[PDB]
């Protein structure tokens, strides 16, 4: 029979006021004989209607994939409102329900600290510039690198690790050609998180 999967908005979308966050209620393993679905969406127990059905995808294992997207306000989400999708289909003796929401827990400001390469990496061809984000709750975050207004793409980031105070931490690392680090260039580490002033902070790093 059919199955339901309810996914949250991207952290960026909930944090950039100029983006458009949305929950996505996916329905897989959907039969040809009764492909029809009903969605009812509820926000904090109370029904809403501005749902939308994205176009039906044929799966090539003979099942259909029907998906419902609900748009949601930034502030509703960030205040921990609960979003319930309910799915009903003829091949499903009882409707299925799923809830999601922001992880419950008092929000905590991330502490952001940049870190120059080891005197020891200096020999090697390429160097690692580190951004450390610690002491943040909840774990929904975005980290980006840049220099002179411009995105640097050779970075990598660790999944948020649970600390022993109950907060989260991660390290983001960017690799540049050594000479560039030498050449006086200035790199920036951009962190977007809810418990921050304007959901955004930035930190720079350079030679000395």
């Amino acid at each position: 029979g059919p199955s339901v999967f309810l996914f949250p908005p991207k952290p960026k979308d909930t944090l950039m006021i100029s983006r458009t966050p949305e929950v996505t209620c996916v329905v897989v393993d959907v039969s040809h004989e009764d492909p029809e679905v009903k969605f009812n969406w509820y926000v904090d127990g109370v029904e809403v209607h501005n749902a939308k059905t994205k176009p039906r995808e044929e799966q090539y294992n003979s099942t259909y994939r029907v998906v419902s997207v609900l748009t949601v306000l930034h502030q509703d989400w960030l205040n921990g409102k609960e979003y319930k999708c309910k799915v009903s289909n003829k091949a499903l003796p009882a409707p299925i329900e799923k809830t999601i929401s922001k992880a419950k827990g008092q929000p905590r400001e991330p502490q952001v600290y940049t870190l120059p390469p080891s005197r020891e990496e200096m020999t090697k061809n390429q160097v690692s510039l580190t951004c450390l984000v610690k002491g943040f709750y909840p774990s929904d975050i975005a980290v980006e690198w840049e220099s002179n207004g411009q995105p640097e793409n050779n970075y990598k980031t660790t999944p948020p690790v649970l600390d022993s105070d109950g907060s989260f931490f991660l390290m983001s690392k960017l690799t540049v050609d050594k000479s560039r680090w030498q050449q006086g260039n200035v790199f920036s580490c951009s962190v977007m998180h809810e418990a921050l002033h304007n959901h955004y902070t930035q930190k720079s790093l350079s030679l000395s």
Partner: peptide, 13 residues
């Protein structure tokens, strides 16, 4: 104040 990201508005309180 307001924060901008890659010249795209992030947030204003």
């Amino acid at each position: 104040d307001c924060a901008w990201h890659l010249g795209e508005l992030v947030w204003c309180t």
